[PDB]
Design an enzyme around this catalytic site. Sequence first.
Site, mmCIF file in Angstrom:
data_model
loop_
_atom_site.group_PDB
_atom_site.id
_atom_site.type_symbol
_atom_site.label_atom_id
_atom_site.label_comp_id
_atom_site.label_asym_id
_atom_site.label_seq_id
_atom_site.Cartn_x
_atom_site.Cartn_y
_atom_site.Cartn_z
ATOM 1 N N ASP A 126 -28.420 8.176 48.646
ATOM 2 C CA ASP A 126 -27.328 9.139 48.820
ATOM 3 C C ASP A 126 -27.693 10.628 48.607
ATOM 4 O O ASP A 126 -26.848 11.502 48.820
ATOM 5 C CB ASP A 126 -26.096 8.720 47.976
ATOM 6 C CG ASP A 126 -26.452 8.299 46.539
ATOM 7 O OD1 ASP A 126 -27.619 8.535 46.121
ATOM 8 O OD2 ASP A 126 -25.581 7.703 45.832
ATOM 9 N N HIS A 133 -26.354 10.611 42.103
ATOM 10 C CA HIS A 133 -25.356 10.648 41.033
ATOM 11 C C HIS A 133 -25.986 10.341 39.695
ATOM 12 O O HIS A 133 -27.039 9.686 39.640
ATOM 13 C CB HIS A 133 -24.243 9.657 41.337
ATOM 14 C CG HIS A 133 -23.642 9.860 42.687
ATOM 15 N ND1 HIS A 133 -23.949 9.053 43.763
ATOM 16 C CD2 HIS A 133 -22.832 10.835 43.161
ATOM 17 C CE1 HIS A 133 -23.312 9.504 44.834
ATOM 18 N NE2 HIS A 133 -22.624 10.578 44.494
ATOM 19 N N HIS A 187 -24.183 2.972 37.114
ATOM 20 C CA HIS A 187 -23.003 3.561 36.480
ATOM 21 C C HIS A 187 -22.342 2.643 35.464
ATOM 22 O O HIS A 187 -21.624 3.119 34.589
ATOM 23 C CB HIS A 187 -21.965 3.952 37.534
ATOM 24 C CG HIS A 187 -22.409 5.058 38.438
ATOM 25 N ND1 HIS A 187 -22.965 6.228 37.967
ATOM 26 C CD2 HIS A 187 -22.375 5.173 39.784
ATOM 27 C CE1 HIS A 187 -23.250 7.018 38.987
ATOM 28 N NE2 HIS A 187 -22.901 6.402 40.100
ATOM 29 N N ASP A 198 -31.096 8.086 42.676
ATOM 30 C CA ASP A 198 -29.763 8.132 43.260
ATOM 31 C C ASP A 198 -29.223 9.519 42.956
ATOM 32 O O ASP A 198 -29.536 10.106 41.915
ATOM 33 C CB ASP A 198 -28.853 7.031 42.662
ATOM 34 C CG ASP A 198 -27.397 7.134 43.133
ATOM 35 O OD1 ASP A 198 -26.717 8.134 42.839
ATOM 36 O OD2 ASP A 198 -26.882 6.229 43.798
HETATM 37 C C1 LIG Z 1 -13.355 11.222 44.697
HETATM 38 C C2 LIG Z 1 -12.373 10.143 44.373
HETATM 39 N N1 LIG Z 1 -11.034 10.284 44.259
HETATM 40 N N2 LIG Z 1 -10.461 9.031 43.959
HETATM 41 C C3 LIG Z 1 -8.983 9.078 43.816
HETATM 42 C C4 LIG Z 1 -11.343 8.027 43.851
HETATM 43 C C5 LIG Z 1 -10.967 6.597 43.547
HETATM 44 C C6 LIG Z 1 -12.643 8.711 44.126
HETATM 45 N N3 LIG Z 1 -13.923 8.176 44.133
HETATM 46 N N4 LIG Z 1 -14.931 8.914 43.949
HETATM 47 C C7 LIG Z 1 -16.276 8.492 43.913
HETATM 48 C C8 LIG Z 1 -16.626 7.515 42.997
HETATM 49 C C9 LIG Z 1 -17.933 7.058 42.893
HETATM 50 C C10 LIG Z 1 -18.943 7.568 43.698
HETATM 51 C C11 LIG Z 1 -20.288 6.953 43.502
HETATM 52 C C12 LIG Z 1 -21.306 7.120 44.346
HETATM 53 C C13 LIG Z 1 -22.639 6.486 44.156
HETATM 54 O O1 LIG Z 1 -23.565 6.778 44.894
HETATM 55 N N5 LIG Z 1 -23.020 5.736 43.152
HETATM 56 O O2 LIG Z 1 -24.407 5.748 42.982
HETATM 57 C C14 LIG Z 1 -18.609 8.569 44.627
HETATM 58 C C15 LIG Z 1 -17.285 9.034 44.723
HETATM 59 K K LIG Z 2 -29.558 9.932 39.317
HETATM 60 ZN ZN LIG Z 3 -25.191 7.369 43.893
#
Ligand SMILES: Cc1nn(C)c(C)c1/N=N/c1ccc(/C=C/C(=O)NO)cc1
Ligand SMILES: [K+]
Ligand SMILES: [Zn+2]
Lengths: 368, 374
Positions: free
Chosen positions: B267, B181, B142, B179
């Site tokens: 994931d 995402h 990311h 992944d």
């Molecule tokens: C929702 C939410 N709400 N807030 C306020 C926050 C700070 C939140 N984070 N969300 C996320 C942010 C990043 C991922 C990455 C996953 C991965 O597997 N990377 O490969 C998943 C959920």
């Molecule tokens: K991906």
């Molecule tokens: Zn991911």
Amino acid sequence: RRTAFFFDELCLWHAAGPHALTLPVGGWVQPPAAAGHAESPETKRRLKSLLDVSGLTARLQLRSAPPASDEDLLRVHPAHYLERFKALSDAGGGSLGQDAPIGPGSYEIARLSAGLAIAALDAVLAGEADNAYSLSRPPGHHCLPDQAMGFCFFANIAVAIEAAKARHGVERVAVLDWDVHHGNGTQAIYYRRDDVLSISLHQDGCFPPGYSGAEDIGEDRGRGFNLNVPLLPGGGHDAYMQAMQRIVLPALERFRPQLIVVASGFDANAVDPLARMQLHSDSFRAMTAMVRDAAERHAGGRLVVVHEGGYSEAYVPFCGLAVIEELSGVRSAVRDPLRDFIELQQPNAAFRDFQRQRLEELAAQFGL
Amino acid sequence: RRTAFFFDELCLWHAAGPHALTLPVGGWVQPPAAAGHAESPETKRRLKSLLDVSGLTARLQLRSAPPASDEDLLRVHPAHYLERFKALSDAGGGSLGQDAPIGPGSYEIARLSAGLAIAALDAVLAGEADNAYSLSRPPGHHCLPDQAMGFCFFANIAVAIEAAKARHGVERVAVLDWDVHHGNGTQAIYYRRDDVLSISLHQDGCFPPGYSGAEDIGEDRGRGFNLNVPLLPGGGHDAYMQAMQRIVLPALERFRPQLIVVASGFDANAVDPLARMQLHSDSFRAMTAMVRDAAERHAGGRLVVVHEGGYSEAYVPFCGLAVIEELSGVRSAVRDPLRDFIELQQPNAAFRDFQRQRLEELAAQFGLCPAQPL
Ligand SMILES: Cc1nn(C)c(C)c1/N=N/c1ccc(/C=C/C(=O)NO)cc1
Ligand SMILES: [K+]
Ligand SMILES: [Zn+2]
Ligand SMILES: Cc1nn(C)c(C)c1/N=N/c1ccc(/C=C/C(=O)NO)cc1
Ligand SMILES: [K+]
Ligand SMILES: [K+]
Ligand SMILES: [K+]
Ligand SMILES: [Zn+2]
């Protein structure tokens, strides 16, 4: 609106053996450094803490209850099930089945959990409250009369409904089960009966695994008084609203329930490890709002919500809080921090329409 | 087969502030009694423990690496990003962005994580190993050149690829990111380039939230050298196999990669809290088997797998173990306890066919051509 909240601290003390999520520890499953189990006290404890911290608890009628009597339990469960369960709980815990581990003293805690469900229905039928929420742990909707499964050890809702009919003489009860898993215990118990309408929205084939159940509409007098809505995995808000609008509300409109009971699991939320659906806290709010509208129509407002699954420590508290706000008609200051994020993750138009077409087809199959 | 395993204990020591899953603690989010963060050490630690306990570690070339040098990091990241990150890490942690919290000393650990990715590519290109697995934590896919997001603080795979090109002079690198995402960092970095083919399979609109990206195929010389495959939530094994067969392998067949790099998050597994897909350990095995076949065809076997996401403590260890068995060609005694259960939960035929039709339509949009491997 008066909303009763049935809770007891002791329900949070029921604890099975070491697990990593749903897997027993041992063999290739390493013992967790912390976690312990998925059906954990913390999901329910954090909801309670949030209700306290939000101020919402102060605006509800806080009640405990006496545990379920043998008479109440025997209306659903054979005596031999009660003795077997008691024996193992007395002996120091173990396994009642796979997906059904117990700790020492789990018998007394399960009785208490069922007691809270009994008392909730009682209180709404006696006019003590307009509606009620029972924080029943352990859960009940998977439990069969002589088999514990899915972390459920008594059919809490079935026991509460039988005690309600025996005490008050209600004739038409509707159970809407929106836990993400199929409510097989409730279905089995009332499968040949027309006095209890059993509806289950669930993820197609999730738990029990591979089970869809749309064809299973009840036997005998129960034929047409059981409805399974197997939603496609990955569905979220719109899928549920369509299911509610096209199946659930028409079904209730025809059945004319005198009491509505909700088996409310929150494991359909978008961050739950044990299912693949995408619900947010306002989905449960909207569902609660729709089901209250139907209770006001047919049941004189009489609605009971019983807590079932939900395995996200972080998010379940917000989803349950939204339900209780809707029941009480009291809006707290709490704001769902994942709401806006989860909205963006919803199914695209083409996927929504694909799910919508299936629900229209299911509606026609049921004759609605 | 010689398989190198790049790991360092210190990578497991990177720890941000208190979180409940992805949510920062504070306000209406109560502090967890235990958990702490989703991107936590334990997912990676349990994988390592399982590899040890299975005997598999003993059959691999266990390596550490020196941290990434400034020269390596500057090939992707501006100096200003490096100083700003260092400054905050030195100061005691905080936020580089939302979804990008850091602890004290996270700068040194992120450098190490990037170092391991550098070394893995190096080792495969130098003939020290046939393939390699880098247990890089924190993850990288990311990370943008001057913005940290999604718990990623350096573009580990981009840094490793640039150092590889600078040292060895590889001309065609393919990055397959599975992944769950969208690998936005890798896409951005190589968007106008034709020397790096970037492919991302992801859950449609999961993270970044609401992003699909099928229309985004690269700019300039990069036009046609970036492919996004937004899978419908709730998909599992068949959805991925179709995506691999209809998009990924044909794309690689045309591009003729001299090196293949996998950004391997787990994931997409069926019990992950951070996505809605239904993969089991043999899905990752099958994907690894397919991607090894393509590396043997075009790249002389040269394949590197870099660890990205995966948030199930219980299940990630099995999924990663299946990948490493496939890489090494060594089958351990370990048996996936959720495999049979997850099979029963898969999408029904009508849903599978709906997803299949969409992938066929996407294939035609890319102009991809379903030829078989040759
Ligand atoms: C929702 C939410 N709400 N807030 C306020 C926050 C700070 C939140 N984070 N969300 C996320 C942010 C990043 C991922 C990455 C996953 C991965 O597997 N990377 O490969 C998943 C959920
Ligand atoms: K991906
Ligand atoms: Zn991911
Ligand atoms: C034990 C065990 N062993 N194995 C091998 C597997 C796959 C196991 N559990 N599966 C389960 C059991 C229960 C649920 C959800 C219950 C619920 O939501 N109630 O509302 C989900 C998965
Ligand atoms: K259900
Ligand atoms: K029925
Ligand atoms: K590119
Ligand atoms: Zn459930």
